[PDB]
Write a protein that binds this DNA or RNA. Structure first.
Length: 190
DNA sequence: TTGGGGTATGGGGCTTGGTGG
DNA sequence: CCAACCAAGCCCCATACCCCAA
């Protein structure tokens, strides 16, 4: 917003080199994947004489000195609550990434999904047949019926809840053993 | 020791509304 | 706190590499 205007850190010499080289390379090699071209460019980097590298190096060092000056000038023109909301935007960012990363890894270790509630299993069935525009509305409809149902009409759902509760228990046990075997006691409950 | 950040894109998943480890 | 139930078009991202600031 105002922090979106925060000066960015310069990227390093290999990154510069690559950024410039990609374009040249893709133009000489239309039928190729980026990943490949990148591998190719990295090799070029390795190959490049130190005296040449040193050129990009100096570019980066001087570009860092600009960042130094830039960031501090930036901070002065900000209020203290601003200075803080900045630092928080950074932390929040980093934590979201950490979050995403652990969530990917669990899914890739096929970690059992949590027990679905009495209400969950109802929604998973009475959503196709539901009035409304967005999902917001298609939901309030199913919500209204939830209040309007009674004990007898909630059996085969609360039954499947109680079943899924035992599915969870079993699946969680298979998975936690699996994990112990794979050297990861750390992903265990408690 | 770690990880972010440059690209481009092919598969990934976070979002908006009101019951459960 | 965060995950679960229903969308799907945008948020993000690992991938190929290297390097240096935190």
């Amino acid at each position: 917003s105002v922090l979106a205007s925060c000066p960015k850190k310069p990227v390093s010499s290999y990154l510069r080199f690559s950024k410039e080289q990609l374009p040249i390379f893709k133009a000489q090699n239309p039928d190729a994947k980026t990943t490949e071209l990148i591998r190719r460019i990295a090799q070029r980097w390795r190959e490049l004489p130190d005296s040449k590298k040193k050129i990009y190096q100096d570019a980066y060092r001087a570009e860092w000195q600009v960042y130094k000056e830039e960031i501090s000038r930036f901070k002065e023109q900000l209020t203290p609550s601003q200075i803080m909301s900045l630092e928080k935007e950074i932390m929040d960012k980093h934590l979201k990434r950490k979050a995403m990363t652990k969530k990917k890894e669990l899914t890739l270790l096929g970690k059992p999904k949590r027990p679905r509630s009495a209400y969950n299993v109802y929604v998973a069935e009475r959503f196709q047949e539901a009035k409304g525009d967005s999902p917001q509305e298609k939901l309030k409809t199913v919500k209204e019926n939830w209040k309007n149902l009674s004990d007898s009409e909630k059996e085969l759902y609360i039954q499947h809840a109680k079943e899924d509760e035992t599915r969870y228990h079993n699946e969680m046990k298979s998975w936690e053993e699996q994990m112990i075997e794979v050297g990861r006691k750390d992903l265990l409950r408690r």
